[PDB]
Structure formats: structure tokens, C-alpha cells
Amino acid sequence: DTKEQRILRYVQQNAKPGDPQSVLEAIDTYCTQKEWAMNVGDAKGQIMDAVIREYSPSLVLELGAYCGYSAVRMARLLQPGARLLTMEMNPDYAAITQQMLNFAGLQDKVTILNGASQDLIPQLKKKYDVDTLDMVFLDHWKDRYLPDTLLLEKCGLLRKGTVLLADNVIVPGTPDFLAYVRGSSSFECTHYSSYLEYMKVVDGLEKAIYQGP
Ligand SMILES: Nc1ncc2ncn(CCCCCNC(=O)c3cc(-c4ccc(F)cc4)cc(O)c3O)c2n1
Ligand SMILES: [Cl-]
Ligand SMILES: [Cl-]
Ligand SMILES: [Mg+2]
């Protein structure tokens, strides 16, 4: 089997069904004690939680679900009726994510879209009935943060106040995205310094609030 299958099995055998917090703790324990994996982790996850609670978004888009760790983290804090759309282009990872959400009991709040951001973002309005997004969590290929931000704008998916929250802006880094949003009058940016998941290595999240064209 794969590392992702091992993470899922570990959750299934060490967390409580329908208890998202137990799911997060099981993933973090596995990834600390057994095998590192690119989940956002608890350090940056706590900052994510604070952001989600501040904004109480009704409709969130995630780019790059992986195993569903961040999807569980966000979805467990959403208000009744609020929704997460999470994109994962790797079909094996998309299946892990679905099963993770199912175990956590969050499947009614989340729709896992198996495809690439460049193909799916232009379909969001017509195919997934989206008007505008309240928040976007960027966690996919780091060289896609900037083009997909620009694509979301082109497609009319951002409104005044839409919160972009970007993982890994330090490691592996997203220098073009950071330079762009920090220099643009269309974004109000805040950096949240933290640590790479499961490691004593500095990383951070960037929040970039869209201000309109
Ligand atoms: N276009 C499109 N559309 C949709 C999609 N769905 C999935 N993908 C592709 C996602 C591929 C994984 C992206 N994430 C990372 O590479 C990542 C890496 C590290 C890391 C690694 C090694 C180190 F030594 C240190 C840090 C840490 C992180 O937290 C990361 O998130 C998509 N792409
Ligand atoms: Cl994650
Ligand atoms: Cl961590
Ligand atoms: Mg990441």
C-alpha cells in the first residue's frame, strides 16, 4: 500500500467515527510518529481555525485536498448549511479524501471534485451553482497559486471581502503569488508566521483579502 492508505487506515483504527477532532489528532500522531506527510498540520491548522472562526464562510473552495486533513479541519467549523468544495486532481488521493470525510461524518458538508484547478475553476458557476466564493484555501502546486488567483478573478468568483488563505508561502514557497498580492491594491494581505507541518522549519500562511477590481 501507499502512505496515504496507511494514514487512512490509521485514522479508521485510532479515531472515533463521526468525531472530526479525533480524526485530526490521529493524522497528526501518525505523521509525527510514523511517516511525514504534506497535511497542513496542527501548527498552521490552529491559524486556519482562527481564520475560519473569524469569517464564518458559507462557501469555501479548497485547491489540493490531499488526504482531506484541511477539509476536515475547515468543514468541522462551518455553520449548519455552509459548504466546502475541495479539488484534488490525483484520483487515488481524491478517494482517500472522500473516505476521510465519510469517516469524520462531514460528507454532507463537502464535495470532493476530482480534477485540475485549471479545468474546474471555469466550471464552478454553471456546473456547481457557485455565485461567488467566501474563502479560498490554496494548497496545490505552488506555481499555481498566482495563475489560479487570476483565473478565479477572471471567472467572476471573487467578491469584495473574499478571503484567500495560502499554505506554504515560505516552504516550498510561492514567491510570485506573494509579490503579486502584496503589491496589488486589489488585496489586503497579512502574513501568519508558523512552522512546516510536523517539522521545526519556519513556514507561514498568507491571508489576502480581495478588495474588488
Ligand atoms: N493544478 C492543480 N489542481 C488541482 C490539484 N489537486 C492537487 N494538485 C496537486 C497538489 C500537489 C501537492 C501540492 N502541495 C505541496 O507540494 C506541498 C509540499 C510541501 C513540502 C514538500 C517537501 C518539503 F521538503 C517541504 C514541504 C508541503 C506542503 O504543505 C505542501 O502542500 C492540484 N493541482
Ligand atoms: Cl491538508
Ligand atoms: Cl504541526
Ligand atoms: Mg501545504
Curated annotation (Swiss-Prot):
Its EC number is 2.1.1.6. S-adenosyl-L-methionine binds at V40, E62, S70, E88, M89, G115, A116, S117, Q118, D139. Keywords: Catecholamine metabolism, Cell membrane, Cytoplasm, Lipid metabolism, Magnesium, Membrane, Metal-binding, Methyltransferase, Neurotransmitter degradation, Phosphoprotein, S-adenosyl-L-methionine, Signal-anchor, Transferase, Transmembrane, Transmembrane helix. Binds 1 Mg(2+) ion per subunit. Mg(2+) binds at D139, D167, N168. Substrate binds at K142, N168, E197. GO terms for molecular function: catechol O-methyltransferase activity; magnesium ion binding. Catalyzes the O-methylation, and thereby the inactivation, of catecholamine neurotransmitters and catechol hormones. Also shortens the biological half-lives of certain neuroactive drugs, like L-DOPA, alpha-methyl DOPA and isoproterenol. This is Catechol O-methyltransferase. The gene is Comt.
